[PDB]
Design a protein around this ligand. Structure first.
Ligand SMILES: CC(=O)N[C@H]1[C@H](O[C@@H]2[C@@H](OC[C@H]3O[C@H](O)[C@@H](O)[C@@H](O[C@H]4O[C@H](CO)[C@@H](O)[C@H](O)[C@@H]4O)[C@@H]3O)O[C@H](CO)[C@@H](O)[C@@H]2O)O[C@H](CO)[C@@H](O)[C@@H]1O
Ligand SMILES: O=c1ccn([C@@H]2O[C@H](COP(=O)(O)OP(=O)(O)O[C@H]3O[C@H](CO)[C@@H](O)[C@H](O)[C@H]3F)[C@@H](O)[C@H]2O)c(=O)[nH]1
Length: 504
């Protein structure tokens, strides 16, 4: 009944051999196996991992179900999407190493059988999977709702999650209206403080100036369509560097050295010899740029002005968020930055040329943020499993609360970030009446209730407070056009933004 850490993958390899759909994920785990085992040993030396209860865990991979018709397993080796498979691989491995009893499902049959068996304590699932869960179990699916952790790469903002509020705003997202606690949404990057950051591990095989060809650039973009209207950009880079590619070819200049779609180990070799990894603008927020940076590549990161969102970009229409991307990879831009990441206006030929010349003259510094290491991911998911409880113990602890007042036109996300903090939506409940507001030296001469994502709000001219009337509408996202927002912030560990200092 207590969890014991695992240091041998033999049982995991047995579980993943049982579906062809797991093949790509099994090969990833195999490539990274020695790093994983080193990391769970290192974590166990730093932190008491004793006295943890072994959980029975459902892992339901909706994206790999026949019944989903997503056909992601089908394209895993031929240039199809991999970012979700990377995250599922790393989650399953983390759960396994931490000693939990994992029940892996990629079918309605397995889903039914596991949930039939009872004693499930935690459920990892995607939004496509959650639709299947609800249909399969019937009305008692809600009995398990507080155990769900929903892998949702791009994030779900509260205004899309609240079914009635979303309807009232005319949000037609096919992904939203689940009415969960939004911290139950697990994201690919820490872009949505209403949600939890799950992430993944960045694959790299280094243990360097002679290995790396100073002259060699590699284009990020494994599909021909991605290269449309990039020729001035690529011509500037080609003035100074060889331009290589991994494309599965009418958009691709004649001078480009195409290697085709590479296996994991061959791609990693290509990164380790590359000076510059070249963003074209798409895809958004993938793992590949972090893999490049972990291998000592600089990343040329197209700047978006205006920032891209469901308001101006087809890709984002129907996604359950209004979040705006300031670049192809905002995490790389904001949490890494120069010299590893150069965020440039692709239409500023002088800025592009200056960036390429700078990168040519840079010293090579392989870099991985701690939160994207094996040990960083184990520490984060262990903390979530042990401390995150939506089933009713307050975590993060109230000690971590720092209250900030967002100016008009400023969100709670923005005001926390501007103080090197992060919005903590679990603390909004402590900011939502006259008495609580005195504590933080805001004085409500009058007040009212509103069901609005933009409250609690303060008019400092009229000394008027609007408080939240629907607790499911508490939202880090959103700026009040007229009033100040009363914003719950917390500290974060540098390199581990998911955790406060007193959260371990
Ligand atoms: C796996 C998952 O749900 N990932 C996140 C999701 O991302 C979207 C998702 O779409 C999955 C596939 O769903 C259907 O099977 C199709 O619509 C696929 O499109 C394919 O065919 C199109 C032609 O009809 C073509 O335009 C396109 O090139 C593609 O080959 C979808 O791929 O997964 C993909 C893969 O990363 C992603 O690009 C999609 O945005 O978004 C959810 C909401 O934000 C998120 O919760 C989830 O994690
Ligand atoms: O055929 C396709 C494929 C993708 N896309 C789009 O690209 C998006 C992100 O691609 P992907 O998830 O595979 O991540 P990427 O950064 O390329 O890294 C993978 O691929 C890398 C190898 O290139 C690998 O090293 C890394 O670990 C992986 F995560 C995906 O959500 C699709 O919208 C597409 O439209 N058509």
């Amino acid at each position: 009944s207590l969890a014991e850490i695992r240091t041998d993958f033999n049982i995991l390899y047995s579980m993943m051999k049982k579906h062809e759909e797991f093949r790509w994920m099994r090969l990833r785990i195999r490539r990274m196996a020695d790093a994983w085992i080193q990391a769970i040993k290192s974590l166990a030396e730093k932190q008491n991992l004793e006295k943890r209860k072994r959980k029975k865990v459902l892992v339901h991979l909706g994206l790999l179900t026949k019944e989903s018709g997503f056909k992601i397993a089908e394209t895993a080796f031929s240039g199809g999407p991999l970012g979700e498979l990377v995250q599922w691989s790393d989650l399953i491995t983390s759960l396994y190493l931490l000693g939990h009893d994992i029940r892996i499902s990629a079918s309605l049959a397995e889903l039914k059988e596991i949930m039939g068996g009872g004693g499930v304590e935690l459920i990892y699932i995607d939004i496509v999977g959650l639709a299947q869960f609800k249909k399969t179990l019937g009305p008692s699916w809600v009995h398990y709702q507080c155990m769900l952790r929903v892998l949702d790469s791009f994030g779900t903002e509260p205004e899309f999650n609240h079914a009635n509020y979303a309807q009232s705003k005319g949000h037609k997202t096919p992904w939203g209206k689940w009415n969960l606690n939004p911290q139950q949404f697990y994201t690919m990057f820490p872009h949505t403080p209403d949600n939890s950051f799950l992430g993944f591990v960045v694959e790299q095989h280094l243990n360097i100036n002679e290995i790396k060809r100073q002259n060699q650039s590699l284009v990020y973009g494994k599909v021909d369509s991605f290269w449309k209207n990039k020729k001035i950009y690529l011509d500037i880079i080609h003035t100074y560097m060889e331009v290589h590619a991994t494309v599965y070819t009418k958009n691709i200049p004649s001078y480009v050295k195409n290697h085709g779609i590479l296996s994991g180990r061959d791609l990693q070799f290509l990164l380790r010899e590359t000076k510059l990894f070249v963003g074209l603008g798409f895809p958004y927020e993938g793992p590949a740029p972090l893999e490049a940076i972990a291998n000592g590549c600089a990343f040329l990161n197209p700047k978006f002005n205006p920032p891209k969102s469901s308001k101006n970009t087809d890709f984002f229409i129907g996604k359950p968020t209004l979040r705006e991307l300031t670049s192809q990879h905002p995490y790389a831009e904001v949490f890494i930055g120069r010299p590893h990441v150069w965020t440039v206006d692709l239409n500023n030929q002088e800025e592009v040329e200056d960036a390429v010349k700078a990168i040519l003259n840079q010293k090579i510094e392989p870099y991985m943020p701690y939160e994207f290491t094996c040990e960083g991911m184990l520490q984060r998911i262990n903390a979530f499993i042990e401390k995150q409880d939506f089933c009713h113990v307050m975590w993060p602890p109230l000690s971590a609360l720092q209250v900030k007042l967002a100016e008009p036109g400023q969100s709670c996300k923005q005001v926390c970030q501007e103080s090197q903090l992060i919005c903590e939506p679990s603390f909004f409940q402590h900011l939502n009446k006259d008495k609580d507001m005195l504590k933080y030296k805001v004085t409500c001469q009058s007040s009212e209730l509103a069901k609005d994502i933009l409250v609690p709000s303060f008019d400092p001219k009229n000394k008027h407070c609007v408080f939240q009337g629907d607790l499911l509408l508490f939202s880090c996202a959103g700026a009040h056009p007229r009033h100040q927002r009363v914003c719950p912030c917390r500290d974060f560990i540098k390199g581990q933004v998911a955790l406060c200092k007193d959260c371990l």
